[PDB]
């Protein structure tokens, strides 16, 4: 999971 957005 990206640390900079939750958007897929």
């Amino acid at each position, epitope marked *: *999971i990206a*640390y*900079y*957005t*939750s*958007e*897929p």
Partner: single-chain antibody, 251 residues
């Protein structure tokens, strides 16, 4: 199991502030985004923002800029939301939810905030904050055409939603979610990425769609299916919900 434990109800005067907590158990706190949701009677569900307790990156719905401030304390695995300068529009139940690969599957029990002249002095001032956002263009409008639907028990029903743009991602997934909120409960995730059944949800529930139009089909409706069904898009910030479809039994 994953648990999110939220702080106690607040009853506070106009003009005060509150700071509420969401204590996380059962998973790695610094790995997953936590989102916050406002449930105000007559106003469905509304997405506030999210935060990554590992990086402290945060993103806000612009509607809440100057209203909500999100923080996290990794020493106690606790996330916080401060609401500043409270008005009667802020009276609502506020939820935290863990974002598991875009699925808001784990929800806190909610913190009730009631603004009233007969209330207290609140938590006191604080870090009023900021952090957003999506690109700053148009938000995705999620429309549920029916505010309610009445069904005979054991018969089946369709709940409809549509999005103002396609929710189809280039990875092939369609970022559409269905939630049910029963009386006195937190929202429950039913279907994730358009057609995937969430753990522990009966396979009486089915999700389908085109990309811009969607159907939650509830086969053989039971008493435990009564509540408000919401669609939500998790494609782009800010995340947005439909206005909700109340299912009632015609018993």
């Amino acid at each position: 199991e994953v648990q999110l434990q939220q702080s106690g109800a607040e009853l506070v005067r106009p003009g005060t502030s509150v700071k509420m907590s969401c204590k996380a158990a059962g998973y790695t706190f610094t790995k997953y985004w936590i989102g916050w949701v406002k449930q105000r009677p007559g106003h469905g569900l509304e997405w506030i923002g999210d935060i990554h307790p590992g990086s402290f990156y945060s993103n806000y719905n612009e509607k809440f800029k100057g209203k909500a401030t999100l923080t996290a304390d990794t020493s106690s695995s606790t996330a916080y939301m401060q609401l500043s300068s409270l008005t009667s529009e802020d009276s609502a139940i506020y939820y935290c939810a863990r974002d598991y690969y875009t699925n808001y599957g784990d929800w806190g029990q909610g913190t009730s905030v009631t603004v009233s002249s007969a209330g207290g002095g609140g938590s006191g001032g604080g870090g009023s904050g900021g952090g957003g956002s999506g690109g700053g263009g148009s938000d995705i409008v999620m429309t549920q055409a029916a505010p309610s639907v009445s069904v005979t028990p054991g018969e089946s029903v369709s709940i409809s939603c549509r999005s103002s743009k396609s929710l189809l991602h280039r990875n092939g997934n369609t970022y559409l979610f269905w939630f049910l909120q029963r009386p006195g409960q937190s929202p429950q995730l039913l279907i994730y990425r358009m057609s995937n059944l969430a753990s522990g949800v009966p396979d009486r529930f089915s999700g389908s769609g085109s990309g811009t139009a969607f159907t939650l089909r509830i086969s053989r409706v039971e008493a435990e299916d009564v509540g408000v069904y919401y669609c939500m898009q998790h494609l782009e910030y800010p995340y947005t919900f439909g206005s909700g479809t109340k299912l009632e039994l015609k018993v």
